[PDB]
Amino acid sequence: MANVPWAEVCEKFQAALALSRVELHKNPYKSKYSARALLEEVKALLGPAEGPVAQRAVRLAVIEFHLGVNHIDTEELSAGEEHLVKCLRLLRRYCISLCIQAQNNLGILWSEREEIETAQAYLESSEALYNQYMKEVEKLTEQERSKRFEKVYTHNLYYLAQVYQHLEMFEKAAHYCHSTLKRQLEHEWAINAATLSQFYINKLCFMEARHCLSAANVIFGQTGKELYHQRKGEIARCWIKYCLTLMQNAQLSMQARELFLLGQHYVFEAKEFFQIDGYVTDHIEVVQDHSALFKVLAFFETDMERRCKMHKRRIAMLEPLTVDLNPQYYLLVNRQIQFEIAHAYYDMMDLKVAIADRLRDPDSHIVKKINNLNKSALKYYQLFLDSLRDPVLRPAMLAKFRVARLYGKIITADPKKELENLATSLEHYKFIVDYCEKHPEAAQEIEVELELSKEMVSLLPTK
């Protein structure tokens, strides 16, 4: 009886790799266990009871890899981690192939472990050994022993980017997954381009964002081609990040018309695909960003009126979609859309006071439009307080100031209703401030303004 020759280890390699490869397809309670039983039969066939004879070293390294895949098959990886760290110690005492296989095993076990600090420390040590390899002091190859190193480099870099994005670490993780995108398109990419564009939204450089993002669009066009599509939601979030980039560029510009034209084309194609791909919550977000871009995209005086009735038609298309279901989720999104229509009525009232400042106020159709708008906004604020119990510092104070101005300037009734309405607004925020015991931001000067208003409307209508 001699030792294990090359033919026996090659037929064992072929059999084990072929059955594990046809088992990882996942076309069951025993077939995966039959692959694990064959591999533990090889484990018993090992029999452990320059350097030494390299056949034993190669077979122990590949059987440590097979023990690791058996442990990830059985989800009891403690003995697998023990055997692999002993393999790491014996390869330290005992190079390309062994260290890259040990590093892939370490990466997959510390990705299984989900402990952040140990996984990131082991990934930094494998990266340090990678930089040491870049320092640099057979029969049937895949591609010159280079394609295997290429794919495990991309896999290890994507997994360390995942461990880094489990932390905050945004700049270095973003650079690392951009390197994975470059290394992949030189030889999941939609979500990786999505988080690149989201980080660049969090950043300030948008030209490189548009460069890599249009590269993502043209490789979506030239992907080349089953059941799990996900492209609808993926480019839906891409259109979402497109309008968020439009939001931040309009915000930095406001605090020419080519932005209007690109907004027209991109949000038109976006709204077309958003009508294609569902939805309920996505459509709430759609009319949210549509109304918000209609607020931020200001042109002129007479251009404001058509834009206001445009986003009024937008919220009038929002409204009858969520009437039939009505969960408490509808109550929460009803509170958000009442805040949105409150902002829309604030913009409409700025339009109306500009019109009353520059043009004639007591005209018939203008009075009809403003009293219809006042009645609809009173109903909308009635629903907004119906979100509160009829029988956190910023939006409550903003809603109080908005309903205080609504109590103030919209009526020309018998001259006591506006006075009692501003009085109850003052007492409402007095109850708010003795209920919260906290200091406000602008409500103190709007309270002293409403107190002086209480004095002058206590004096002047009586005269």
Author numbering: 1 to 27, 32 to 53, 84 to 128, 134 to 176, 192 to 241, 248 to 285, 301 to 330, 392 to 527, ...
Sentences from the paper on this structure:
Kinesins are a superfamily of microtubule (MT)-based molecular motors that play important roles in cellular functions such as mitosis, cell motility, and intracellular transport. The kinesin motor domain is the MT-binding engine that drives these activities, converting the chemical energy of ATP binding and hydrolysis into mechanical force.
The 3D structure of the ~72 kDa KBP at 4.6 Å resolution was determined using cryo-EM data collected using a Volta phase plate (VPP), and an atomic model was calculated. Nine pairs of anti-parallel α-helices (αHP1 [α-helical pair 1] to αHP9) are broken by a single ‘linker α-helix’ (LαH) and ‘linker loop’ (LL) in the centre of the fold separating KBP into N-terminal and C-terminal subdomains. The four predicted TPR motifs contribute exclusively to α-helical pairs in the N-terminal subdomain. The supercoiling α-helical pairs form concave and convex faces linked by short and long loops that constitute the two edges of the α-solenoid. The LL is the longest (62 residues) and is thus unique in the KBP structure because it is reasonably conserved and mainly ordered, with visible corresponding density clearly bridging the N- and C-terminal subdomains. Despite this clear ordered density, this loop was not modelled due to low homology to available structures and a lack of consensus in secondary structure prediction. The KBP-alone model is incompatible with KIF15_MD6S binding, due to clashes with L14 in the C-terminal subdomain and αHP3a, αHP4a, and L8 in the N-terminal subdomain.
